[PDB]
Amino acid sequence: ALVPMVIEQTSRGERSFDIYSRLLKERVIFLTGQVEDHMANLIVAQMLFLEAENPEKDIYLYINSPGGVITAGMSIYDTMQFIKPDVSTICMGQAASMGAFLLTAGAKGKRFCLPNSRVMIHQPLGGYQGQATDIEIHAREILKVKGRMNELMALHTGQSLEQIERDTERDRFLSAPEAVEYGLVDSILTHR
Amino acid sequence: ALVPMVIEQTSRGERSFDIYSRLLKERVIFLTGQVEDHMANLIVAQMLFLEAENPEKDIYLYINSPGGVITAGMSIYDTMQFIKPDVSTICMGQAASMGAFLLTAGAKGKRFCLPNSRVMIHQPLGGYQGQATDIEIHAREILKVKGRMNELMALHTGQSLEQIERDTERDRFLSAPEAVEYGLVDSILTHR
Amino acid sequence: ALVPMVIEQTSRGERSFDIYSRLLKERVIFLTGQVEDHMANLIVAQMLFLEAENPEKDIYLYINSPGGVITAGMSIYDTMQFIKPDVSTICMGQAASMGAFLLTAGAKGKRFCLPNSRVMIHQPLGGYQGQATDIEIHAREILKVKGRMNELMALHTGQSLEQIERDTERDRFLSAPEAVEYGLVDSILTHR
Amino acid sequence: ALVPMVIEQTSRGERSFDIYSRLLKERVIFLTGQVEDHMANLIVAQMLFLEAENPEKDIYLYINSPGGVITAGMSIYDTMQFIKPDVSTICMGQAASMGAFLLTAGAKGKRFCLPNSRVMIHQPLGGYQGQATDIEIHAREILKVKGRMNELMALHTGQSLEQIERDTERDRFLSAPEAVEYGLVDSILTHR
Amino acid sequence: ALVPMVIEQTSRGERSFDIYSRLLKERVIFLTGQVEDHMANLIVAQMLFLEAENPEKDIYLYINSPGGVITAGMSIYDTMQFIKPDVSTICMGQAASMGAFLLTAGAKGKRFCLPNSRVMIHQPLGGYQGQATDIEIHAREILKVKGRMNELMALHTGQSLEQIERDTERDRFLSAPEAVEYGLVDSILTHR
Amino acid sequence: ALVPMVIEQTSRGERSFDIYSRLLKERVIFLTGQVEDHMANLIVAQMLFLEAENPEKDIYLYINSPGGVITAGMSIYDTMQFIKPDVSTICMGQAASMGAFLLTAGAKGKRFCLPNSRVMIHQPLGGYQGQATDIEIHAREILKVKGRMNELMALHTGQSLEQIERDTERDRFLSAPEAVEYGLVDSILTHR
Amino acid sequence: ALVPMVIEQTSRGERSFDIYSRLLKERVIFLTGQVEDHMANLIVAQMLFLEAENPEKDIYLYINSPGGVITAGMSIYDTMQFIKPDVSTICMGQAASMGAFLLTAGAKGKRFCLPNSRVMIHQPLGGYQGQATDIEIHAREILKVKGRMNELMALHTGQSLEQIERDTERDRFLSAPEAVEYGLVDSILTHR
Amino acid sequence: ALVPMVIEQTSRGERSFDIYSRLLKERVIFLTGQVEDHMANLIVAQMLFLEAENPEKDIYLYINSPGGVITAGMSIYDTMQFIKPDVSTICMGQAASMGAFLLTAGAKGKRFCLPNSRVMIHQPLGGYQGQATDIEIHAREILKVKGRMNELMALHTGQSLEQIERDTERDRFLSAPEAVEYGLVDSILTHR
Amino acid sequence: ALVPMVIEQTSRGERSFDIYSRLLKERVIFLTGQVEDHMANLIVAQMLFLEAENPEKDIYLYINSPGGVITAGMSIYDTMQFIKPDVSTICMGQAASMGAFLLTAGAKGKRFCLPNSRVMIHQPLGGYQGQATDIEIHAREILKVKGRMNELMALHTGQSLEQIERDTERDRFLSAPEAVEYGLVDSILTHR
Amino acid sequence: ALVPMVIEQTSRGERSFDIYSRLLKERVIFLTGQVEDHMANLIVAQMLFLEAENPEKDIYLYINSPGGVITAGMSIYDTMQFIKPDVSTICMGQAASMGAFLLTAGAKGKRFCLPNSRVMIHQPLGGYQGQATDIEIHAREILKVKGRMNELMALHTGQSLEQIERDTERDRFLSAPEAVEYGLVDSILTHR
């Protein structure tokens, strides 16, 4: 019973559903832990599934994540922009590195975070071993990636590009009220 | 049978339910072991689930935990303070560190612990490796967290902030009667 | 087939039940292996369930275990004392250390053990590493626990406190007839 | 609950399927992780299954993978060309190495990638230990494969063979707009 | 969801089968990965099952494998020859070593491979440690096996025995068109 | 040459001694690295040897060390106090923990440190595992040692005892000028 | 001979020394590999030994090292400044990090490097684990060291302090001509 | 006897030196195995020692090595160019990578190799992990080194710079007669 | 005493040499173990040393070794062919692979083996991992070496090249008299 | 003092020799432990050394050995037969396997063993992994050795060849009196 069962009444009222499936039914998706490929593929499958179910309703994404692989994370980034319905992202716990990136990518006006949460941002990491010529190729690609993400942060936050450039040089930590002022989230949820 | 099944009768019931799901129906949630992200993620889902079923009834949270990750613990804390119904926390076994933190966060007047339990509190731990510049950044963040945790302790317990500041310098152990006197819990359950 | 199925009859049933669930239904709980947090947590859930189904009948606890974590063991102890129906404990195989402690915690007149069983008792173990200041703090806490466990032994067995302290300095082994004379159990079951 | 369940209505409505089975029903297949033999044996079974279900409709293949074993990739490669309905390949995240090989192999006019994706191509890798005579045999086989892979790239992309030969000498990275101009994909999906 | 489910309508309409069972029903068996005892044992059970289901219809065996244990593989070989209906083998990906051996053992006129596949053949491997007397016994046995394997290759392929012996001295790789000319397969499948 | 040889002339001039023996001859002892039993024993043998050669002349002890095991360190301390000639201690690099303790134990008026050195002091560390009874014994002994070390610090430095106790609760770092003002050393050497 | 012996004539001519001792005799000291405590201690012993032999003659220090422990490096630095004769440093191979620091510490007008050498400089690294209180203490100390390290660079190179701070934020590599222009060395040696 | 002793007569005849010292006396230095810091440091000492002994006589350097660290190899190179007597290099066994570089650095007209030797040349290897900004710094530095090594090859061999760049793209193996035509060596030694 | 000392008299009788040096003095060199770089390097030094001592006298090389790395072995081979005095090679125990190669390279008429010895010959081994292009480069170099080694076997033994080529396809073992007939050695030593 | 020094008087009397060198002087050689190549090589060097010293006097070889590699051991065997003076072998402790082989190889009439020593003999051990073709080559190679070892045993002991072959199929143990009767040794030593 790592994951409990719940029961809901309908017509027949017989069906029971793993608590996470019960939430998927209500259009709630959770993103937790490291961002990698298998995890991300599952999240994308859930979004495509909900898009098909009802193209006219919002999807709520709950984020609590330390970061992860950029390539994997970008498949979520693009799915969210490609599917028709809005995705509203809510930050709880933490949204760091790639987690923060996806958090700001939610529908404008619908980006919210709980009051004791933390958001942290920073330039991408990477590395390589090989011949001097291969090193050059791989170095150029990571720099292009850094530049591209810098452009997307400016687009979603409203900050100038140069300001974004300075702010990601070293780990930058933001409290929930700062994330609001900075422009990463629109508001802080407080009480029901 | 790591987890046994139980049987209940209702309308046409029948229906068997893993003993932990049987208790979820009674609005009982257990929090045990280390506080981490996957566990915490699941508890939050359970609280949202109960909040939706009946916004007007109390949720009982059983705590028996040695401590854990602060970020994960804060996710739980913020949900408890958001959802409409009261959460009544009961400490059994131990509530140490972050576990103690969540124990006192329950609804006022409803924080209760069993007579042979133990509660322990202490300032947060952490660390880092890197360039002197990055060490500075990370040191500032841990100090801010320490400060925030102390304010929340003072708020929930009624102690002055300085008293909280002195008492968490080193591990402080409290017996159940001491937790009551100090202000971490309101009362001790004895016999039905 | 690690755990076999059994079939029972009722009205319409039939009904197949993991052999351990079949016994939970008869108000029988088994406690085996090391006492720890996850397992203890489950024992507690089972006792609360049975208490609700029929507050007027006894619960039988079968004990066969080498010992374990005191904190986890205390949660079981407090629940046994809190709930309304008597809990009758039966020792088979062995009841050592924390296992022996819980054995004597059963309802008076209802503590029974099988004739070739063994009971062993001893003062608690522990340890620590750190600054001399931290060592003192932790040393005091273990001594407080030792004192508390002795009080409870004296209370439940009828021995004076001084006698309990002398007898637990080093491991002490008792045969079933010795446990009866000493006061840990009330009687020995032989043949039906 | 690693994979959530979804419920759909039909006549009776008794349909409960893991989200991936639910999407197979809509003719969507995902390819993620390394390309190997057990995985690229399940994809083949799924494509054959869909071909029979309806020989006149498109199959959608989502590709997000770093590369893999050429043999495994080739059984997929040949099945896609053999079966009657078009396979439309969509690149998300990354399509590197053998992953890119399969991406370009989809139906003409239907090869598309999301805007922040990456495609990377390069000559095949391998190795051997043994007698000089065996080394020669194995060296020849890998060179034949390199030659064959280059012909297939030229066929599908429209580049001359010599241009393909010059571009795969070292890891070549292409951004989504570059893949379009180069000829690996036909277009970029933007919004539904 | 490692293996997806598929639904099939009949009379009443309730059929849910793992995709691999769905294909067994169509008389398709898949042989992949290393050939060993447990897997070989399952392939034989499936063939006997189909033989009984309908003695007058062909069985299709899909082969994609690097090789394996001769002893285990020979139990598949003998079953294929014993049973009544023809077994048609199709090579995809690769058929190396023992894989190639089983490939050519299918019904004459029905051995077919896909165009980008590879087939590789070689003399058997083995080894031993022990006293000089034991080494001799084990050396003789492996040589008898080499002899028997060559006779069967010559029988099924039409090559003279001497030609088979020369060609298996060292790893020999054959492309799909060569396998056809050599006589390992009868033809190459192209498009539906 | 992990350690080089040097040549000096006396009478006949045939003197080639390892560089460390050459300096022992000038009544110079180097103490570096962790202070543990085998190494400390050698430091003591060297001091006894020098005392015998000339009871009226000073011995120079160079200190550069991160810490030690205390017991070993005390045998060095007591020897320095017991032998007749003054031991003048010089701190280069660092003198932490036990190293700092021995540094201040040098003859009054002769404690000196180089200008870019660091001195750090703190209360002793330790630990134990066992029965609650043994834990008590070991905890008492470490506290007695802490007390004794503080008395010796106050004696040698001129600080009040109360001040020493407060200052060793947490690691305290002192720059060379701070060591002078505090009273750990008498002066800073500058240039010959 | 891991290290060869050489023969030199004097008076009787019976002189056979380890080539490194032969060079110590010419007032040549080599500093190579990581800078740590045991090796640094030896370098200091050699300099004291040479200072005693002839206070009026220059000592030559050859440097080829990647870096090391700051504390160990400082004991070398202070001895060089303390002893009377000029120490002339020569860089061959590389002088990185702490090695670069010691290189510039040589007598003004006598710092020289070979033409294909490399010099690299950066801010110091460090780290720590523990209670938030201890983290603060250790973070403060590393920052103080960083500050001290910048003052000495500016002192020896003639650069302004602000310029030094900017230039050590991230590793900066200098070719031999750059080291001269920047002021780390006075000149480049070419041919005897 | 890892290394044997040999006897030679001068005056008194009492000379028994390790065979390698015996050859150092004849101005012969051997460079074997990987080039690294400690070994390179020793070669430099031998070369300086021989220059002093007799500035007018050639030094013979035997090379047999697979390659090594560029920095260490460069300190050898600079010494060869700095010291006054010519250094004649002779290659036996192999001179690969950095080993080949040093081979060509010998005095013009005196570079010679044995007839069955092999010489191999290639571009520098390296790598790095860290932030995109740090990658940018290190990648640039390895490219600067590559450029410098190519200039030195062209200078010593007489090849144009463009020709050197093309030839070091991938491992290039040369036989002794090829090394002569290319210009890495002046001639092949045959028989005494 | 892994290696014993022996005493011999010349003039004053003061000669005590390691038994291996005692035999080096008689112009005897032993070759045992694998032929690698460091060991081969020592043999070359010994042969150069003996050549200088007396250019007109034979050098005896005892061979007992299982194999080697070829490159190191070729430096031994070239030295034997360069130095003026004949080298007489004697095989005892075994001369396999590279050992056999060096055995046959000795002076004609002076190659001899003991009667119970074994000689074994085979084509060279090697391997490589990497891009298909690099595999091709490395795969060519190993074949050039195979070619050259066969050319030298034929030259020294008198066998035709075609015959050598056939005989080294697989391990070929020869007894002492067979080696004589084949032409690897000139004769068998029997008794003094 | 792993090995002690001993003093002897000769002429002047300045003689101090390791105890093993002292015994070599008396023509005593010890063979102990496993037989391998580095060890065997030393024994041969010692025997060649003694043969030269005095061709007319016996050499004593003490054997105490569990066995070892035949190839290495045969180099001792052949040297013993080649050199002019008789070699007398004495067995103490044990002479097993190859150790027994060498024991009987001593001069006829001079093979002696101590009364509680034990001797054990058995056919050769070995093994191989590879292609069936290589297995055959290596298997024949070990059988030839078995045959040759059998001939030599019969030659030295006087047993017929058929008897030797029957006796070595399984480990055969002989007490000292049986070794004498069998013919492995000539007699048993008793007391001086």
mmCIF file of C-alpha atoms in Angstrom, chain B residues 52-162:
data_model
loop_
_atom_site.group_PDB
_atom_site.id
_atom_site.type_symbol
_atom_site.label_atom_id
_atom_site.label_comp_id
_atom_site.label_asym_id
_atom_site.label_seq_id
_atom_site.Cartn_x
_atom_site.Cartn_y
_atom_site.Cartn_z
ATOM 1 C CA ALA B 52 -12.402 17.629 -1.568
ATOM 2 C CA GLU B 53 -14.483 14.836 -0.079
ATOM 3 C CA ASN B 54 -15.686 16.918 2.824
ATOM 4 C CA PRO B 55 -14.308 20.422 3.457
ATOM 5 C CA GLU B 56 -15.963 20.546 6.861
ATOM 6 C CA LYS B 57 -14.319 17.660 8.664
ATOM 7 C CA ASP B 58 -11.064 17.185 10.468
ATOM 8 C CA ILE B 59 -8.148 15.200 9.149
ATOM 9 C CA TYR B 60 -6.052 13.233 11.608
ATOM 10 C CA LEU B 61 -2.324 13.063 11.029
ATOM 11 C CA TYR B 62 -0.332 10.436 12.882
ATOM 12 C CA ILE B 63 3.327 11.332 13.212
ATOM 13 C CA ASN B 64 6.199 9.017 13.960
ATOM 14 C CA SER B 65 9.302 10.329 12.311
ATOM 15 C CA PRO B 66 13.050 10.920 12.926
ATOM 16 C CA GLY B 67 13.328 13.942 10.673
ATOM 17 C CA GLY B 68 14.152 14.577 7.042
ATOM 18 C CA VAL B 69 14.575 17.065 4.221
ATOM 19 C CA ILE B 70 13.352 20.557 4.922
ATOM 20 C CA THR B 71 12.124 21.338 1.495
ATOM 21 C CA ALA B 72 9.992 18.237 1.440
ATOM 22 C CA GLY B 73 8.712 19.015 4.893
ATOM 23 C CA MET B 74 7.758 22.525 3.869
ATOM 24 C CA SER B 75 5.606 21.205 1.097
ATOM 25 C CA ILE B 76 3.550 19.430 3.703
ATOM 26 C CA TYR B 77 3.480 22.453 5.956
ATOM 27 C CA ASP B 78 2.145 24.796 3.355
ATOM 28 C CA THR B 79 -0.627 22.473 2.310
ATOM 29 C CA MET B 80 -1.787 22.062 5.879
ATOM 30 C CA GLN B 81 -2.074 25.800 6.196
ATOM 31 C CA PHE B 82 -3.990 26.191 2.931
ATOM 32 C CA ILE B 83 -6.685 23.586 2.950
ATOM 33 C CA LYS B 84 -9.911 24.453 4.660
ATOM 34 C CA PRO B 85 -10.459 21.688 7.331
ATOM 35 C CA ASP B 86 -8.369 21.441 10.446
ATOM 36 C CA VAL B 87 -5.559 19.025 10.665
ATOM 37 C CA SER B 88 -5.089 17.522 14.063
ATOM 38 C CA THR B 89 -1.684 16.089 14.631
ATOM 39 C CA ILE B 90 -0.928 13.262 17.013
ATOM 40 C CA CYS B 91 2.616 12.332 17.995
ATOM 41 C CA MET B 92 3.444 8.701 18.767
ATOM 42 C CA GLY B 93 6.850 7.176 18.870
ATOM 43 C CA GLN B 94 8.972 10.211 18.069
ATOM 44 C CA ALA B 95 8.824 13.532 16.369
ATOM 45 C CA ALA B 96 12.297 14.727 15.780
ATOM 46 C CA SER B 97 13.668 17.645 13.905
ATOM 47 C CA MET B 98 11.492 18.287 10.911
ATOM 48 C CA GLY B 99 9.036 15.825 12.364
ATOM 49 C CA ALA B 100 8.618 18.055 15.411
ATOM 50 C CA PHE B 101 8.249 21.022 13.148
ATOM 51 C CA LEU B 102 5.212 19.541 11.463
ATOM 52 C CA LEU B 103 3.728 18.324 14.742
ATOM 53 C CA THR B 104 3.314 21.831 16.074
ATOM 54 C CA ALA B 105 1.844 23.048 12.843
ATOM 55 C CA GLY B 106 -1.460 21.333 13.456
ATOM 56 C CA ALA B 107 -4.637 23.161 14.410
ATOM 57 C CA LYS B 108 -4.421 24.996 17.682
ATOM 58 C CA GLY B 109 -5.996 23.102 20.520
ATOM 59 C CA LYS B 110 -5.732 19.889 18.631
ATOM 60 C CA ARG B 111 -2.024 19.041 18.964
ATOM 61 C CA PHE B 112 -1.780 15.878 21.049
ATOM 62 C CA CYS B 113 0.863 13.302 21.915
ATOM 63 C CA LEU B 114 0.986 9.953 23.663
ATOM 64 C CA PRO B 115 2.606 9.728 27.138
ATOM 65 C CA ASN B 116 5.739 7.797 26.299
ATOM 66 C CA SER B 117 6.659 9.744 23.222
ATOM 67 C CA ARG B 118 9.674 11.986 22.622
ATOM 68 C CA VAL B 119 10.120 15.230 20.815
ATOM 69 C CA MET B 120 13.442 16.667 19.773
ATOM 70 C CA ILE B 121 14.333 19.968 18.130
ATOM 71 C CA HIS B 122 17.455 21.530 16.581
ATOM 72 C CA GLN B 123 18.793 24.093 14.066
ATOM 73 C CA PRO B 124 19.021 22.900 10.387
ATOM 74 C CA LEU B 125 22.033 21.154 8.878
ATOM 75 C CA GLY B 126 23.646 21.548 5.470
ATOM 76 C CA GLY B 127 26.908 21.972 3.572
ATOM 77 C CA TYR B 128 28.684 22.753 0.288
ATOM 78 C CA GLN B 129 31.897 22.472 -1.788
ATOM 79 C CA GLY B 130 33.330 24.909 -4.316
ATOM 80 C CA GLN B 131 34.871 28.288 -4.980
ATOM 81 C CA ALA B 132 34.945 30.762 -2.136
ATOM 82 C CA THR B 133 32.348 32.811 -4.002
ATOM 83 C CA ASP B 134 29.914 29.943 -4.203
ATOM 84 C CA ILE B 135 30.476 29.063 -0.618
ATOM 85 C CA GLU B 136 29.305 32.532 0.294
ATOM 86 C CA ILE B 137 26.136 32.169 -1.677
ATOM 87 C CA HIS B 138 25.271 28.898 -0.143
ATOM 88 C CA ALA B 139 26.098 29.990 3.369
ATOM 89 C CA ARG B 140 23.728 32.905 3.114
ATOM 90 C CA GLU B 141 20.891 30.727 2.031
ATOM 91 C CA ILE B 142 21.195 28.298 4.872
ATOM 92 C CA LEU B 143 21.239 31.101 7.350
ATOM 93 C CA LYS B 144 18.085 32.568 5.899
ATOM 94 C CA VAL B 145 16.361 29.266 6.266
ATOM 95 C CA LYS B 146 17.429 28.953 9.856
ATOM 96 C CA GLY B 147 15.932 32.344 10.531
ATOM 97 C CA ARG B 148 12.664 31.478 8.893
ATOM 98 C CA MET B 149 12.273 28.242 10.747
ATOM 99 C CA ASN B 150 12.737 30.046 14.028
ATOM 100 C CA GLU B 151 10.022 32.523 13.272
ATOM 101 C CA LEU B 152 7.584 29.787 12.536
ATOM 102 C CA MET B 153 8.456 28.019 15.774
ATOM 103 C CA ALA B 154 7.854 31.173 17.729
ATOM 104 C CA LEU B 155 4.584 31.754 15.956
ATOM 105 C CA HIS B 156 3.171 28.344 16.596
ATOM 106 C CA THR B 157 4.487 27.781 20.100
ATOM 107 C CA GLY B 158 4.051 31.175 21.730
ATOM 108 C CA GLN B 159 7.663 31.423 22.814
ATOM 109 C CA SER B 160 9.575 34.609 22.169
ATOM 110 C CA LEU B 161 11.878 34.511 19.224
ATOM 111 C CA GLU B 162 15.012 34.749 21.324
#
